[PDB]
Amino acid sequence: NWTPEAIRGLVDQEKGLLDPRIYADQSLYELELERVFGRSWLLLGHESHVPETGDFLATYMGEDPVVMVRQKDKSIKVFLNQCRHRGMRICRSDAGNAKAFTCSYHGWAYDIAGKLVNVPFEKEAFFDKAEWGPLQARVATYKGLVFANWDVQAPDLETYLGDARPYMDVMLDRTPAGTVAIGGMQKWVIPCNWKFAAEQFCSDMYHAGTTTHLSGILAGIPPEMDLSQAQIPTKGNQFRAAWGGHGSGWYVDEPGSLLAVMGPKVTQYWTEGPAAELAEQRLGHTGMPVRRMVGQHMTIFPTCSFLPGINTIRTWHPRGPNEIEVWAFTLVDADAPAEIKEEYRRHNIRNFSAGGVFEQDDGENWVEIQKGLRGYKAKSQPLNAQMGLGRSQTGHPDFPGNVGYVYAEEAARGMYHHWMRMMSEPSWATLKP
Amino acid sequence: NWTPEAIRGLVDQEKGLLDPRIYADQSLYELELERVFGRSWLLLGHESHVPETGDFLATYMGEDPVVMVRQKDKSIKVFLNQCRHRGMRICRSDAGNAKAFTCSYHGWAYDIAGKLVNVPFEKEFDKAEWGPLQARVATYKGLVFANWDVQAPDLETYLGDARPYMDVMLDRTPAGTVAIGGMQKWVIPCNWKFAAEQFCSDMYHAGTTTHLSGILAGIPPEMDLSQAQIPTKGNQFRAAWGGHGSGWYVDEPGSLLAVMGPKVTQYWTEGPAAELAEQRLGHTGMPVRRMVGQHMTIFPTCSFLPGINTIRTWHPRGPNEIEVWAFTLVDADAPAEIKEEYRRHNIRNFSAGGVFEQDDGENWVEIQKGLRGYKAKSQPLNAQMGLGRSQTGHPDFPGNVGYVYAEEAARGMYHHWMRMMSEPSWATLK
Amino acid sequence: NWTPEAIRGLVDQEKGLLDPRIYADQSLYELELERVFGRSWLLLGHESHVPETGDFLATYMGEDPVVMVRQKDKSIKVFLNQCRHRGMRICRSDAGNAKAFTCSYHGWAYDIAGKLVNVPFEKEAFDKAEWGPLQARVATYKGLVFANWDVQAPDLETYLGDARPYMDVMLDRTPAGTVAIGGMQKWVIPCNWKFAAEQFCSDMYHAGTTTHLSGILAGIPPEMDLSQAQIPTKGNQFRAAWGGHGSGWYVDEPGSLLAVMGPKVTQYWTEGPAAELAEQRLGHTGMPVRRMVGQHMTIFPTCSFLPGINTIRTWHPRGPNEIEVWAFTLVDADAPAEIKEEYRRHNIRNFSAGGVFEQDDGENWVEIQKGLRGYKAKSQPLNAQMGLGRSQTGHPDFPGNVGYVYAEEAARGMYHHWMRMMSEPSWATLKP
Amino acid sequence: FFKTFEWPSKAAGLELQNEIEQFYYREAQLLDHRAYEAWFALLDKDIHYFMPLRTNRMIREGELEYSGDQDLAHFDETHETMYGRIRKVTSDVGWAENPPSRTRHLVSNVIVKETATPDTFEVNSAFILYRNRLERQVDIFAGERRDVLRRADNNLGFSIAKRTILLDASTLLSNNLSMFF
Amino acid sequence: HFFKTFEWPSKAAGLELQNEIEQFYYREAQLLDHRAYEAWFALLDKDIHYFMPLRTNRMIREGELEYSGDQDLAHFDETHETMYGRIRKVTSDVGWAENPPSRTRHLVSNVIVKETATPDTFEVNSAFILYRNRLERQVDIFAGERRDVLRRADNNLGFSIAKRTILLDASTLLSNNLSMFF
Amino acid sequence: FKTFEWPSKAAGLELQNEIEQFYYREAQLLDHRAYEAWFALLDKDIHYFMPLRTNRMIREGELEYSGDQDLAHFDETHETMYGRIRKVTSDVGWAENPPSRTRHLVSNVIVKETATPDTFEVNSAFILYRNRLERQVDIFAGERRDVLRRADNNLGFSIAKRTILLDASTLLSNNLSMFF
């Protein structure tokens, strides 16, 4: 059995080394579900997914299926999609509106809150209904986004997010009207470990600025333009969370990235005009040059990843050490013009979906990485994560927090250190910030 | 290895709680194959599946390829479908008639008894020493069971007090039963204990929500669920020793009619053939003609519904999967019209496309999927139903008896399960 | 954990017994990756696969993806097909020519030697010479390319030992040497490697009995049938003094080879100046190459060939329950055009996934592994007693330990060597 | 036994070949869009709908591959029993198919044979049936169908007098046959 | 934004025309399966709408909500200009998803032809199985139907594509990408 | 191998029909194991070829298929096919005994007009579903390129060439005991 000593010898942020066994080991994964997922704050979706009373969304927390459902008091509850009689699924559609939920096996009946309200033949047999039925999850919201956690001793979402908050507001708090999700949730299966996907959106601008997306940029650039004529952005910054494993990277003053992905109309909306400058004032407390911020990525540990410029957001659902499910959707400002919404929608489909000219290539890399790790020698020696080590500083005038160069792996090392920390430390008294 | 005290921690019949991990854990299944399946009596079929010398049926004894074949002296011995040379399958086909079995790999030849008779270039070690491993063969009125363990009790001793409950299906005529031609097989991605327990103790599913569409299927087109009568009267049996159990309705003719139809319900309840069955099983003192919708499980994986007369074996195939092997029994002398009715209705209801079976399996599949999660295996499942209300002094039915909508037979199945892999030797398992 | 005592009990070469768990156990497989595959000499192919500078072949060492690539200095280097940055595959095609290797993920550039030469934004954000893909030892035997991870393992020549003269039967017939016909046929069989390793090592017994009755019928004239085609009997079986290598061949019986390879290939192999030059070159142990018909050989653990038919393959493991068969065909570089073409035709006809011989092979192997899921199928030992105590080390016809063709002495020694490799941690005891 | 379809020496006219192929394409569109009542309407009151069990047999026993008219089967149905199945599949409380599966019936290899009755044709065809359900469940079926089709003034041009499906499976790899073939 | 049984004409298309549509699809399948992307792209008319909606698990009563709508995310929702960029990507030797290329087979059957309000313009229904094999052992199988609007054209195929909607038999995509064209 | 060079003069509906019907007739023969009659459809000068397929970078695309001097899955004349038929019908051919249950679904049939009367090059797509034993399922997809010469036989045509281009690099099936 994996001893805490051995778990600490898997990740080393000092040497900047990663043991490849963290992505492949079956017994390590079984521990992840308990130590990470069963204790973390996990994305389930947006508030606009469940607007009216009784509206529900069938989703996951790790490998555990859950129902997220809007309550009559306008709150939102999350409970395990499992009947505590003999384990049957309580809610059997992806989404919709429920007056009540009813288990199809033996007909145990539940209210929209997830409470057991009726048991057939409860007088002939049997016991208190108020005590039975699906385990409940803690629910916390953050400016439209809905999060959930099982562990009662875990920190609150606000404390969980901490220093990472202002970097989310670039996407979320542009208008007092707030964000609304475009209809649709794309879902697809990738045979790779969840850490690869999580790390990429956390720290890896480096893949976007080099080789991975040379063809994606080619797809969005003017037909008269060639790759050598297109100019890759090079300047920008990266962020590592004070605690958690969170991080974000972005380009500064170089709209070449955003323009190729999103097009001119969207790039204008983001940087020039009445709405773009209104966002600048609203994010006045941070003191960030939001208009100059073009092309941004972010991961909230462990599985909440999003691109504030593109407005694509997704949860990575784990399916063993060799597989994940991507559940992705798109956000728009509530009051953004009809043409702008249509452009956000078209360009997200074009770039960041299973068939997206950008997303096609990310899941090519991750897949080939996992295959290799089946071999013995492939897991024998550490991998390299040493970029920008001892180079990121907290006292930055332009941006708040621990800031480095755009091509760094400081957030990467910070993510894997907290993976090691959750995997090793059993109690919250030690883990909490 | 799972420690015998940790195994005893999984199932608690006194509290009425079950550990979900029993349905999912890989290491528990490995123990199952050795401890549970390697020493139980397991159904391979019926005597009519092979009535003449040389007739064989390739079947399974929990992952073991096994072959059962009729002999010249009317015996039907069963051996491993494995050639001890390099492990090749001896018999390549599902069924038929053989003169001799020849391995395709190196040509080791065998008679129909299993004995090694010819080894190519053997003159260039005893022939009788290296034949496939023979299982113990024991029949119960046409039903052929097998067991690897020489220490295991005989068939009759094993089945015990639940024999009268099998006699409801297999001993209605002196002619005996005959298996209809054909054996259906299909894969269900669920644990075998869901399937075994349901036929053992779950009438509650059929009396509630699971089979609403199946009832609708067997009811007249002008009639809907609001006109279908909801059954509430009946009892539930628990076996003394073996892991067997039963449930049935009392005085609800409409339940059987919706499943099996007019002619078969008549044949089971009224007339010369139905009355002859009440006098033949009269020694048990059981009101057999008022018995409808009965379900049964012979431990571990032999389950059937008397009246309906579908019979199946659930094959292990891992913790997350099973193979269902089902056939139908009819009485030998039964009219040609009744045999055709029994055939047609079993196909209609209890097959891979069956209007009842579909919904039975759909529950299990979705349960197994949910148990992939960590938290879904963390809390106990409710197995209390009728807790302590099963007294042994009922005037109608022998043994331990409770109300039909209870889980007393369920606890008897899991109790013996726990026991059959926490106790190594037969000296205590009796 | 598998204790060293437990391993030794799995194989009994004295009683000719086999514990069937070795084909099925998951934990035994993962040990095999380390103890067997992580330190054996493994066939990656032939020199003719990579004839020029930069020419590469993506292949495997066990489950480890590797690149075998010819260098400027005409040497062959083998490295782990794994970007040591984040694990990405560096070489993403099967075969071809490279001037460089670039990681598609973050753009780390490599030279054909496997040296890291460029890292994008290195100056803006550690030594490249220390971060190249892991290298394997590379050695060749008369055309065949082998590789090994373990620096402490013996060299290829010592690894092979006295099994070399029987390898020479196929590889050393002419000074010009062997050259591979284009094409590497690959298919997946859900059976464990050892079944196939064994067959080509010792099991001639299967071809002379029942398995290849139908493939023989395909290579026999239409007017003639299975009765008028004797069933080879006389011949010998060899065991290597160390390493679990083994071979088998018929003596003076052309019926086995004629069926498979036809009249023209047999004539080349047994008659004329070419077959005389072959016996001339192999007179070092005084073994008649003219009389040896339809040979089979396994080099431990996963290399297998049929000297007369000239098909050669590697069994790639993919867990206890599946393998990938990677096979190709060899010919003498100086042989005539009609002979080479007949070799090509008759190998495609007979030993590929659809080959009239090979069809029946997998069919048997698939079935065995399926049965091995059973507990009772894994309870009692298997038989490997054929030819026990009927072999000595001193024949005026053949060198080394020689027994009857339908024996299983070579098989016993293969499992014996496997047993030793699994249980002995240091080469200080394993080596000869 | 069934064996090779006894195809007629003279090929069916280009009009009739089109009509019967178009019928199967239409029938597939009904099934694939869950138009179960519309599909059921194609079945004649004397319909026999049959899918025998299939077993592994040696060459010495080729005659016993498919199960007989007195043996159990996957389907052995009359107009009445078929309608029961339609009731179940269209039911809001039929859990096997609510939520419904997503199916595709790909139809090919259509061989048309005339009968002794005018307006009536015997047809042989091949299908692949792709079934996807729940989140990630996929079941693929393949086989042949042997039909008796009568010309009909309905929506499709023909009604189904008889159907036999020969499925390329021993043990069913799918947990159910909630689909119609 | 729902889909139901294709509305085939009661008078079946002429045997000559039925054959022309069938052959056109066989030729289209040939271009794609042989990676002649430029020749395939030439088939797309300037007013092309290329649409593949998301598909969800719904109760029978909520049937009208099974597919995503024209203001929802989709797997594909394309114009000539967006398709152009996709063709530019798939032909690019730094387009990693299709370099090395996949091996595909588009099997086309169930062809149903309907005339439109425009002469020489046809609304076409068809079924397909798309078998995709790439790298060493990766296999992705897709099945679905295509709803096409075709125009007669003076090209080597006989027709051009004005609209295409693909109804895919999947909710969650079982493939890691959709680097292929349907 | 490149895109099949279909005739721009779109083949006649009359002939289009009998070509497709032939393939369906042929498919019926193969799935019902009438090997004797299916072989009879092959002319003496027949070439039954199925090349190996490899993963190649775009710049090395020409080397995707194995050449006429390379190994392959199949490369057969008349006397080589004859031998296979003898095995596949044999009682001691255990790869096909017990027989496999197969489906040869055939579509995408394109018939090509050559200068020679009664000779037409024919392309077809296929999916081959192979089920055998208890639970083995092998799925194959690809294309077949044929010549086909008009004959006075039960099926109406004879085969004088067949190239099978399979959609696989590594073969995911344990063998090719079936015919394509």
Ligand SMILES: c1ccc(-c2ccccc2)cc1
């Ligand atoms: C992770 C994921 C996506 C991106 C990204 C993609 C396109 C444009 C800008 C950033 C960067 C890191």
Ligand SMILES: c1ccc(-c2ccccc2)cc1
């Ligand atoms: C193992 C594999 C193949 C053969 C073999 C088969 C036919 C002719 C010659 C050798 C012998 C052992």
Ligand code: FES
């Ligand atoms: S499973 Fe929910 S009540 Fe039986």
Ligand code: FES
């Ligand atoms: S395995 Fe049965 S003879 Fe070799």
Ligand code: FES
């Ligand atoms: S993985 Fe190769 S450069 Fe990052």
Ligand SMILES: [Fe+2]
């Ligand atoms: Fe990316």
Ligand SMILES: [Fe+2]
């Ligand atoms: Fe039931």
Ligand SMILES: [Fe+2]
């Ligand atoms: Fe062999």
